[PDB]
């Protein structure tokens, strides 16, 4: 996250870190056994780390649980990044508490202007490269479909939304992929793609979670 602030410890209890030797993407706990993330984050061994704040230090609220199943959306397209969404089943259930909680799926899609919270441990800098140990946060608005599509002509599908700022300087970046965009208590976005990070007139684009409730529910029921 560029242009963000350090979240209060454990104040984002649905946020997960996916790890295979080190942190590489985020994710969101949506029930005690299942995490949602980005298909482009796929690797075939993942460990899920719940209840994290400082990824570099064992702090003692953490639960580390390996993925038992990894299910990428059957229409994920690695060229357009359409359907950039993936479900992970944990090999045993998360224990839910103060520091570890589920986030709601959307009851509908969100209006333009709605303020949301975006979180993750990705790159913090426009020029260069510094990855934080402490979880970062960013408040930003859902942009209209028109400001999203003027930013990326021909490349915004119906399963994508733009969240952020046209003046640059505030956005998600590499390492935040897979991570939550939460608006009015509902997960409406997954960190997906952009052109660079925090560039003027290239806000981040996000998988539009509201189109995916039926697929998510069905996949959980069948696995
Ligand atoms: Ca820790």
UniProtKB/Swiss-Prot annotation:
Q: Name one GO molecular function term.
A: serine-type endopeptidase activity
Coiled coil ranges (UniProt) are none
Q: Provide the binding site for Ca(2+).
A: 52, 54, 57, 62
What is the reaction catalyzed? Preferential cleavage: Arg-|-Xaa, Lys-|-Xaa
Q: Which GO terms describe its biological process?
A: digestion; proteolysis
Provide the E.C. number(s) assigned to this enzyme: 3.4.21.4
User: Which spans are transmembrane here?
Assistant: none
Fetch the PROSITE patterns from UniProt.
TRYPSIN_DOM, TRYPSIN_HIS, TRYPSIN_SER
| Entry's cofactor comment | Binds 1 Ca(2+) ion per subunit.
**Where are the disulfide bridges?**
7-137, 25-41, 109-210, 116-183, 148-162, 173-197
The UniProt entry, under InterPro entries, shows: Peptidase_S1_PA, Peptidase_S1_PA_chymotrypsin, Peptidase_S1A, Serine_Proteases_S1, Trypsin_dom, TRYPSIN_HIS, TRYPSIN_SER
Its protein name is Trypsin
């Amino acid at each position: 996250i560029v242009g963000g602030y350090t979240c209060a410890a454990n104040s984002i209890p649905y946020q997960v870190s996916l790890n295979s030797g080190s942190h590489f993407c985020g994710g969101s706990l949506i029930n005690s056994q299942w995490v949602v993330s980005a298909a482009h984050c796929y690797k075939s061994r993942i460990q899920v780390r719940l209840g994290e704040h400082n990824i570099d230090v064992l702090e003692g609220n953490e639960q580390f649980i390996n993925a038992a199943k990894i299910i990428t959306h059957p229409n994920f397209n690695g060229n357009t990044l359409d359907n950039d969404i993936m479900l992970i089943k944990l090999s045993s259930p998360a224990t839910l508490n103060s520091r570890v909680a589920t986030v709601s799926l959307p009851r509908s899609c969100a209006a333009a202007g709605t303020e949301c919270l975006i979180s993750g441990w990705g790159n913090t800098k426009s020029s260069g490269s510094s990855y934080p140990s402490l979880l970062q946060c960013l408040k930003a608005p859902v942009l209209s479909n028109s400001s999203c599509k003027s930013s990326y002509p021909g490349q915004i599908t119906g399963n994508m939304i733009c969240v952020g700022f046209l003046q640059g300087g505030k956005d998600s970046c590499q390492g935040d992929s897979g991570g939550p965009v939460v608006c009015n208590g509902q997960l409406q976005g997954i960190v997906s793609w952009g052109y660079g990070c925090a560039q003027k007139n290239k806000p981040g684009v996000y998988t539009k979670v509201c189109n995916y409730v039926n697929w998510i529910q069905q996949t959980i029921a069948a696995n």
